[PDB]
Amino acid sequence: HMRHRTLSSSPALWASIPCPRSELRLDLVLASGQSFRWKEQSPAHWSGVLADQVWTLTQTEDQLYCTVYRGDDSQVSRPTLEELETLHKYFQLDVSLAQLYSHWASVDSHFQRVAQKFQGVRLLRQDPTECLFSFICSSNNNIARITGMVERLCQAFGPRLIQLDDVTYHGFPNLHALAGPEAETHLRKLGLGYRARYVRASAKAILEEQGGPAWLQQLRVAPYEEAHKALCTLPGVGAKVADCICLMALDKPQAVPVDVHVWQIAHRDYGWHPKQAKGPSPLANKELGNFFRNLWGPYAGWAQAVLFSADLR
Ligand SMILES: Cc1cc(C)n(-c2cc(F)c(CC(=O)Nc3noc4c3CCCC4)c(F)c2)n1
Ligand code: NI
């Protein structure tokens, strides 16, 4: 009945945001292991769900074009003022990335070289709940299999929003939906495996032990160090996942997620070694995060995103 919009198809349902392609490149952000809810359904046209609404995004060299599917028996219209603000905040466009790129480049020659080809790699501001459970699914996994688990989870537990072509879009489920007695059994049938236990247990933990998703909003305004320790109390959430949520959902730009893949890059590209544990360890991982914060400063997580994205391509 309804299909994915292109900029050529129905231009009268698109609104623009004055966004240089140096400030944001959709193709290096939306599928670069931050969000797992965006797909290039048509060429240079990215479709995904944001807060119970579906968006399609495309860009020129100077403009970011966006169209909304409000997903109901409502008159089709262009993005509103409030809806465009939501997208402005989601891409954190108030913060200059050009000024950050130059600042990082001044103290790191390796970044200066990589940065040239890979511009507009910025850090998305995600919903804490979506980010939390997305990154519990990320353990010993790849972007493709993570994307599948998150989609299947959302269809199974989340409310239906709209259908565009063959793709049916579901909003991310609330904690109560994931905390139910059959939840783990269902998630195992959807292929999450062991991660199904942590999803249910963490949903149950936030509700019962922390008092619902207002807790995650408290961690947003809490110091990085307090937020990180609070998150590490949840089943399946360790230092790596806690840092991911801190950087991508709780407004901690200094948070640097460290796993074996970040170790590889740090060693190979920066010559970094732990100043006892020859290989990775909780203490050595903590030291590596500090090393990058000392080097790049209070937006070290955003600098890591540039390298991480550049490494995927
Ligand atoms: C063996 C293999 C192959 C692939 C494609 N992966 C893979 C890739 C991923 F992107 C992710 C997700 C992720 O961890 N993203 C991130 N971690 O720190 C950061 C990011 C994003 C930008 C800020 C810093 C994953 F869990 C696995 N692993
Ligand atoms: Ni070495």
Numbering used by the authors: 10 to 284, 287 to 324
Q: From the publication, what sentences describe this entry?
A:
Our approach is applied to discover inhibitors of 8-oxoguanine DNA glycosylase (OGG1), an enzyme that is part of the DNA damage response pathway.
As commercial chemical space lacked elaborations of our most potent inhibitor, further optimization was driven by reaction-based enumeration of virtual libraries using commercial building blocks. The resulting synthetically accessible virtual library contained 6720 molecules that were not available in make-on-demand catalogs. In total, 16 compounds (8-23) were successfully synthesized in-house and detailed synthetic procedures are provided in the Supplementary Information. Crystal structures of complexes were determined for two inhibitors (8 and 17). As the docking algorithm did not take protein flexibility into account, access to multiple structures of OGG1 representing different active site conformations was crucial for successful fragment elaboration.
